[PDB]
Amino acid sequence: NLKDKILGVAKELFIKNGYNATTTGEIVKLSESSKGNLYYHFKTKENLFLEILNIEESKWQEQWKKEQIKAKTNREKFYLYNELSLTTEYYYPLQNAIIEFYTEYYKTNSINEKMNKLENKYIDAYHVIFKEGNLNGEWSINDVNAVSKIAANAVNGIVTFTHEQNINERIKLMNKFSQIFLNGLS
Amino acid sequence: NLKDKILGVAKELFIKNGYNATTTGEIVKLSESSKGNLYYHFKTKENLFLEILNIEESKWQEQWKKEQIKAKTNREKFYLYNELSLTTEYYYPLQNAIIEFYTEYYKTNSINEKMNKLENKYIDAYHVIFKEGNLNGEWSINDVNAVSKIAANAVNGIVTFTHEQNINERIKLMNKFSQIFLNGLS
Ligand SMILES: CN(C)c1ccc(C(=C2C=CC(=[N+](C)C)C=C2)c2ccc(N(C)C)cc2)cc1
Hints:
Homeodomain-like_sf (chains A, B), Tetracycline Repressor, domain 2, binds crystal violet
C-alpha cells in the first residue's frame, strides 16, 4: 500500500530516533515517494505522527481486548493490563517521541485537540476496569475519572523510566505497584 | 573555579539553546577557557551535561533538606515531595535540554549507567521517607527499596505525562495519588 508503507517507516524512525530527530527528508529515502504524497493523506508531520499514534493506541487497545479474557475479575484485569504494558510492542515504544512532540508543539492550540483525543483513549482501559469493578463490588471508587488518570500516568511512568533494567525486575515492581494501588482504593 | 565557570556557562547555554544546539566551541569562548581544558575536566559534551545534571541534583537535595523541615511526619514529607516535584518541574529551565538529551542517549550504555547513579539519588529521598516512616509506626514496608523505586517512577509518570491540564488539576491529581498510594498500606 502507499500511506501504509510510509506510516511503517515513520513509526520506525519516530521510535528509533525521536520526533524531530526524524524528518520528512529521511522518511522518503527509505520509503520511496514524492515529498508531496505525504500532504493529502496526512496534513503535516504533526499528522503523520498523530496518525501513527492513533493506530498504535488502537492496536494495543485491541490486543488488550483479546487478552483481558484471561482475567476473570477486574482486580486481575488491573494487574494484567499494567503487566502487559511492559511487554507489548504498541504505543509505549514511542512514549519518548510523544514527550518530545508534546514539548515541541505544546505552544500551538491544536495540541489540546488531538493530544486530548488520544487522552480519553489511553485512560479508557482503566475507566472500564474501575467503572466495571464498581458495578462488580470489587471496590468503591467515587472519582473514577481521577483514579483512571492517576493509574494511567503512574503506570506509563513505571513503564518508561525503567526501560533499562531486566524485564523481570520491571514486572515485579509493576506488580508491587498494582498491589498497592488497588489496596489503596479501599 | 575555571571548571566551575565552564559548568556555569554551559548551563546557561543549555537553558537558552537546548542540548544539541550548544557547541563546545561557544562554551569554550564564553567561559574564556579552551578545548584542552574542557577535554580535561569532562571529556565530552555528554559528559559535561551529565556533570551539570549531578550538580543540579545536589542543589535539589540541598533544597529539599531545608524544605522538609516544614513536614513534621513522613506521611507529610511524602505529600510535600511529590507536590514539589510537580511544581518545580513546571518551571525548571533545564527541563527541555534534559529531554533533548535523555531521548538521544537511551540506547548507549555509557550514558545509561551514569544516568542511573543519578536517578538513584532522586530515589533516595523516598527511601529516607519510607525507612523513617517505619521507625515511627507511620507504616510498615518490608520492601522499602522496591516501594521507593515505585514511588519515584509513579510520581514522575504523573509529572511527565499530564501537561495538558491546568496546574490546579495536576496538583489535585498528585495529592489524590499520594493519598491512594499512602493508603495502599492498609
Ligand atoms: C521526558 N524525560 C526524558 C524525563 C522526564 C522526567 C525526568 C525526571 C526529573 C528531572 C528533573 C527534575 N527536577 C529538576 C526537579 C525532576 C524529575 C526523573 C525521572 C525519573 C527518575 N527516576 C527513575 C528516579 C528521576 C528523575 C527525566 C527525564
